[PDB]
Assembly symmetry: C3
Homo-oligomer: 386 residues x 3
């Protein structure tokens, strides 16, 4: 009763799922790239997409296609690397699905079902880009974007807010009230710090006047909420901010969940600028202080990751983006970065390498002549050494 | 007197023109993709582009280059597959030219000359995207876009209308009056149904407030005109409409000429949405009722064709588009879809396959949590089967 | 003390620097393309980017990355082909650096240091796109864009002006006052003619109302300044202008420095139009009269160079751009054109070939039906010949 075409395609999918991944020749001394994505639309199990029944699907047509797999939350759970992937259906709605592997760079396979995330209202059209936090209160929190129609004459006009849900296993989710930020009508790129700050739940936020353009909103905010089960933030203290003629000029936002180090919170974030071709997204780092996490204590000039080779092209070209990283006990760091809103990659680094990058890459000299003086200082050091 | 360089380039062009095309490994159970485009700028005969005379063209320079070949009307005519291609010159003006083959997927060759299409006014700057209709009144009609300067201070401001011309052979064309739509100042993506409706000429239309943004214009309209030689439409009844967070959010429009089936009119159309990289065009289907062709009776969620691999990049990236299909008597369907406003491809399907897609692909569940429930229902069916 | 990783990477860089370049199969009878760029981010010497000291750079991390190398001025200097490249750092600021080769198409190597260009004010954030002029007054002039924050609430709002500097060697630069144009608040794509006109310094200019959109500004202007050391232009006489539905519709600007020929000034310039994917840049030619250099005496329809194959994609896709060419005494012409604001290419032609293109390529027929008549005339000539 299973269509004859299924077995051959299932065998091909199994081959893909198991395919080795290889470190490429890319080098910057900070992280490694890999030949293949860790997740693509073709990693979604065939029986999530095809009706296997030859009676009701005689031609074995794809009934529910997958358009893209990207922007994934990431966490280590019972010694497996777990990705809470943003999966965009053929119908253009995204949903979460979990893939796991015993390796950080290959072999990811989706669980039996996608994520059932309870809706709070009847007009939640999309949910996306979940950041996962292993919180000291004992829960795993997912903080994600919730998008609703604005209900105006402009059909494309939408409103973003931060959803909050918690879990022990990434299968069973308790949906808490959406975050309220008293000083901003919309939020995106919100993420929860793993530790209390002054006994409160602490977030990096991103206040926005609109759905695309931020305001008013000058950068990544830091905010405190008394109660995660009724989360309300008032003040949003600016941390890493938009700066003219830098990678963060148009807007910026937190990326991966804040990473705890002895030297501060390592924030792998994204910056946006406008070009003749549209918006360009890159990934950068900044470190915030442990006792004062609204205070930036390191921010290199420029980017850490930008679209490279085949990363440059996809549904939304000229974009790399991350909302997930995994840190192993030995200090290995797996940065899951998507490209062009289409596919998901991994970059492999370490805490020592990322901290050296963050603290020892020169700060942005901001103006061309000072940038040259800065680079000439380096050249002169090297020439002496030679 | 013919430049020595001509013979070698002519031999290379002949090799291209005759080159076999091969079905690729792409699979969705609905249509096949092919390795090569059916038409490109290099398919245009060398002697349409080069001055062959070595006296007046000593260096054998390309005098009238071709920039792109795309958005083609299509019709079967004396047992040949005929494409009325949109050919964009080096000078950025498009014109129509006919290519024919005895095969639907390869071997297309242009006729001796491009199309001489009489202008009605002295300010018709561009004509493009012709839909061909084999009408029951015995004529072949071409319905195309006519673009004129708006004549304002904004040099780029333009006005679109629907031109109508008829022919028996795609060489000799009678230019009729442009369509008038009393309730809309502009039109694009207009196409004529092959059959009368209540004794009148019937069109799918696309009312627009502006040259790029539609309004006001909520989707694809259905309209009736008493007289094709003085075509005037009043009411435009909405059919497939723009829907928030779907592939048709920003705008949509008819694509290929309506295809007659026993189950309704099969409309292979396009949907547009905005992204950080600009507008994204995909192709989708909807079926309208035979007795009430303003009434949509099937509309899958999502798209049928989206830019894939090398289709993604060109003059206008992230676009696929069709205004032509050919249906053989045995039910084979050839969908001619262009990518990125640069080149023309073919997708091969059948009426049975396209109808199964159209009626049996789940309708858009519109909101993420309902999309998941819908996909989980499919997964659960397949797991039981297993 | 030099990190062990340096030697292997230095050997790989040397291999790149020396790599042969090969003419491709591209043909239009006017210019040749080459397989490889003449300059990329990887051509920048490793010791401009890495700290070679293993004590201060234990992981051998890239401290000052290079994002792109493009839009280069070009001049022949002591029998070497010299490129004053726009080098964009990882931090998104550009600066000038000179590369030289004894061949026009390969083997380019950067000098010991980038260019130290004195700033006039403390708010010069970026400088870019220098056009080099070997002037009859005995100096080499560089005319470049100077960009400053507009200082408004809009962080991205910027102001462009034309900087002027002179040199004998491309190392030691005297920075003169920025050009003042009394009738336009901003300027970009300004270039100095190599000869006096009526005893004055003569420029092609590009008046602009804004930083991105021109106005008001209708095309490329011609202006005269009494004193290059206090350069002030009043009237800007229009030359090549924006034309609806041509490659120059949205805006245009001078490209490479005007090239002296017996038949007029050969201007290799750029044209811009808007598309669904963003702005598209192509390169075209026009010739101005020797005695009246505000007067256009040849302007082909269409473009000379457009993005081709891998040129199409980069930081700013769908762009080719030039602000540098080198003319050898034997008439060989090297056009240095960048693609997608990422990398720098060379196109090789000759004065005889470029003049034949400029004067004998049909003028734009402006409207589709007249474009067809024009092409049919050519076809008919060729068919007779056959
Ligand atoms: O698209 C690039 C990035 O934009 C953000 O999101 C999108 C979102 O993915 C779209 O579905 C929606 O239509 O509009 C948003 C535009 O901001 C960013 O946070 C990422 O989600 C995305 O990669
Ligand atoms: O460009 C994508 C699609 O846009 C529509 O047309 C263009 C037209 O091709 C351009 O020449 C003109 O400048 O503006 C229009 C923008 O809508 C669409 O119907 C297709 O023609 C085209 O593939
Ligand atoms: O980007 C395409 C072309 O735009 C012009 O310049 C840019 C400039 O390079 C950017 O750094 C700045 O942010 O905005 C300008 C937009 O016009 C053009 O003259 C070239 O510089 C560039 O290739």
């Amino acid at each position: 009763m299973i269509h004859e075409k299924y077995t051959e395609m299932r065998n091909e999918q199994e081959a893909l799922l198991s395919r080795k991944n290889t470190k490429t020749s890319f080098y910057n001394g900070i992280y490694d790239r890999y030949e293949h994505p860790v997740l693509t639309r073709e990693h979604i199990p065939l029986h999530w997409r095809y009706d296997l029944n030859k009676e009701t699907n005689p031609f074995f047509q794809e009934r529910l296609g997958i358009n893209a797999v990207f922007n994934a939350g990431a966490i280590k759970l019972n010694d497996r690397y777990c990705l809470v992937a943003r999966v965009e259906g053929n119908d253009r709605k995204s949903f979460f699905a979990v893939a796991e592997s015993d390796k950080g760079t290959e072999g990811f396979r989706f669980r039996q079902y996608p994520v059932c995330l309870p809706a709070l209202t009847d007009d939640e059209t999309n949910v996306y880009d979940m950041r996962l936090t292993q919180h000291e209160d004992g829960w795993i929190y997912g903080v994600f974007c919730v998008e609703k129609s604005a209900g105006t004459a402009d059909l494309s006009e939408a409103v973003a807010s931060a959803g909050i849900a918690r879990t022990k296993d990434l299968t069973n989710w308790e949906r808490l009230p959406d975050l309220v930020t008293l000083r901003s009508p919309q939020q995106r790129n919100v993420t929860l710090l793993p530790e209390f700050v002054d006994g409160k739940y602490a977030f990096y936020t991103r206040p926005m006047d609109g759905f695309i353009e931020t305001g008013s909103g000058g950068g990544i905010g830091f905010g405190l909420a008394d109660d995660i089960t009724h989360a309300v933030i008032d003040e949003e203290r600016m941390t890493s901010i938009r700066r003219y003629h830098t990678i963060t000029e148009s807007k910026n936002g937190a990326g991966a969940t804040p990473i705890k180090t002895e030297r501060g919170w390592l924030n792998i974030a994204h910056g946006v600028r406008n070009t003749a071709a549209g918006l360009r997204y890159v990934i950068y780092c900044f470190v915030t202080d442990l006792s004062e996490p609204w205070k930036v204590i390191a921010e290199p000039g420029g980017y850490l990751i930008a679209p490279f080779k085949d990363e440059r092209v996809g549904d939304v070209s000229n974009v790399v983006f991350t909302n997930g990283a995994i840190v192993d006990d030995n200090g290995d760091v797996y940065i899951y970065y998507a490209s062009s809103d289409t596919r998901l990659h991994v970059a492999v680094s370490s805490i020592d390498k990322l901290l050296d990058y963050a603290f020892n890459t020169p700060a942005d000299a901001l103006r061309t002549a000072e940038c040259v003086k800065q680079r000439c200082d380096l050249i002169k050091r090297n020439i002496e050494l030679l």
